[model samples]
Target: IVGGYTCEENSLPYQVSLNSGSHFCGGSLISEQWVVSAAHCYKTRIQVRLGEHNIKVLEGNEQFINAVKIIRHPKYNRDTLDNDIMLIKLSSPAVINARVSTISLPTAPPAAGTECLISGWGNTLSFGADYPDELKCLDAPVLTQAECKASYPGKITNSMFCVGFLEGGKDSCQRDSGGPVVCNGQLQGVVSWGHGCAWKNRPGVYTKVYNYVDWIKDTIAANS
Candidate 1:
């Protein structure tokens, strides 16, 4: 994506030959006719691939699809990462087979202290700028609003959620931004940032997905 980190093996999920490249943390098939990703992934030319893991060579495998419209959140502010999510509407409805899939949106936001899981192909070590190819995941617990605010001292707000490792090894680093932070099987948040990748006291911040449900729905409705 625009703000995330990238390396050799962990490329964005899209066709390799397309004019534009995919650089987000991960890709989600939000609709049969739309592929959802982060606004930061936008480029001159955009392409999308669904259901397959090997993004580059997966073209023509019945999972790849061409994108016609690339729509990003209007309020997305890169400096502050206000609204980091986006939707890629495919030119045609994707051929629905067993492999291709889509994730449903949540009707409401999650409560505090929920356990969330995040997965992505990003840097292994949070510091020094070295990213990994294999997709990694970390289990983090959603912190209280007061705790989240205190952790950041002055940056944390109500629109954001803070998640971090209690054991101190696993974390979502650069290039993992915009990926899903799932809680109770619902897509609850989108990766944003932190003081560092995974600092001991600094927790990873994410855009509260639950808070933007109506906005996402309205945008899609207008576009459709």
Candidate 2:
């Protein structure tokens, strides 16, 4: 997360480090054996690390669960970045505890101006150097679809949404993609794309999570 503070231990229990050998992207644990993230982050070998407050540090509470399957939205478009959501079936269910847990899915699309949080492991600086070992979180507001469209012109879509300051400041950066955007305690979005780290007027684009709830449930039912 850019321009954010270190996350308190266990403050974001649902947050997980999506690793393909090493940290790849941030992910949200939606169930004991399922995780939801951006389709772009898909890798052949994925290991979901739950209760991870730091990327490099070995916190005693961490639970490492390898992924048995990675299901990306079939309609996902890499060029236009549409339908950018995915599901990961954990090799084993992560034990639910104080430091490792699951988060609820979005009940519906969030309204414009909805307050939400984007949490993940990344540098404190937007485009500077050195990643913060600990997880970082940023507070951003959901933008109206029109407002989002205005920022990206032909880039915005119903399958995606934008959140952050128009002038740029706080945001989820490159390494934070596939992370969760929590609104009202529900997983509302996944960090997907943007012009740059925190470019002005190019607020972060996220995979609209509500649109994929049915796919998520169906995939889990069939695979789990």
Candidate 3:
């Protein structure tokens, strides 16, 4: 989180740390046994840490669970970065508590210019410098598709959207991929990719959660 501050402990209970051995990414718990993340963030040995505020210390509220299955969108495109969403089924249902809960997915896209929140354990700067020991969060405004496309000409797609400041100084960075982009208390997007951390006119791109709500519902139902 470039230009962000430490988030209140256990405030965002749905936020989870996706750990792949030595590497880490951010995700959100959408159900007791389901997590939504970016397809590109997948690793061979993925484990999810729920209700975690700090990466270094273990808290009693934490629920570390192994992933039972990972299902990436069938149309996911790595080159174009379209359909970058993925779902992880936990081996068992997470025990919901004050410090562990699920976030509601959006039924529609958030209106342009709406204020959104993004939380993660990603680096404070690009190039992997100053990785925070505690969770960080930042507020960003949803950018219009036209404005966003103008920033990254011929890059923004229908399945994707943008969020950040036009002048930069605040945006998600490395390891923040797959985290939530929440607006109006609903999960609106999943952190996908970006040019750099808080670069001028280069807002962070995200997979529009509203575009895949049907797919997510179907996938979970089929798997269940």
Candidate 4:
């Protein structure tokens, strides 16, 4: 129920691999020739693993996409993780099989308290634990705006959304940053932060995709 790759019809999706010994996390194929992800996933040569879930492999049956260009959000500030997003352009357009393809971006945000699903190769705990070689997913509900503000008062900004269990034990971990948070087939959020892997008081935070719709579209058009 939790380890299948993101495979869909007419969609060719993949992940952005980091060279500093980290796995792929935040990534999006905005156009036939472009991909988007978190800025930190850049730096060195990134490996775009298409059609596969394992990191130390090509799966032998799938194609790979190499990075031709890496564009970080101009306002991206790593220190506070502000505007901490990036766009990647693949050298070629991946072949989208109807069964395994890329997911579309959401045009709007979901109502608060909507249930969403997120996947990653990050740890399930707060300490330095790693995810399985394959992808892993979990379900969580979006937190109310007021509740979110009260929980991560210093971390949750206008650009982000809050998610997790208030009672604890459910959250996104380190390597999960930049991955998609889907709700009703729409990408509503991108994993951003969490107090710990699964802390009681802290819930994971994500970049609300809809909030930056204009900026994202404008950036893509200008760059393209």
Best by TM-score: 3
Q: What is the TM-score of each candidate against the true structure?
A: 0.79, 0.97, 0.98, 0.84
Q: Summing lDDT over every window of 10 consecutive residues in candidate 1, give the lowest-scoring window.
A: 10-19
What is candidate 4's lDDT per residue for 145-222, written digit by digit as tens?
788878877776677778778887667777767777878877777777767667777777777777667777787687
lDDT of all predictions: 0.63, 0.88, 0.91, 0.66
Which lDDT tens digits does candidate 1 get at residues 1-224? 11233322322232111224544456556678765566665664665555443444533544545778877788777777667777777777876655555566766776777786676655667557654433455667887777677777777656687776533455677777657777776777777777766666667777787777887788779878
Pick by lDDT: which candidate is best?
3
How accurate locally is residue 4 in candidate 3, as Cα lDDT from 0 to 100? 93
Clashing pairs in 3: none
Per-candidate clash tally: 4, 0, 0, 13
Residue runs of model 1 more than 4 Å from their true location after superposition: 1-24, 55-62
- Preferred candidate (lDDT higher): 3 or 4: 3
Full candidate order by TM-score, most accurate first: 3, 2, 4, 1
| Candidate 1, position 133, lDDT | 37
TM-score of 4: 0.84
Q: Where is model 2 poorest over a 10-residue stretch in terms of lDDT? A: 122-131
Which clashing pairs does model 2 show?
none
By the TM-score metric, which is better: model 2 or model 4?
2
lDDT of 2 by residue, 1-224 (tens): 77777778889999999987778799999899999999999899988899888678886998998999999999999889899999999988999998988999988898898999999875456666566778898888999898899999998878989889998878788779899999999999999988877778878999989998888888889997
- From the highest lDDT down, the ranking of the candidates is 3, 2, 4, 1
Segments of candidate 3 deviating more than 4 angstroms:
126-128
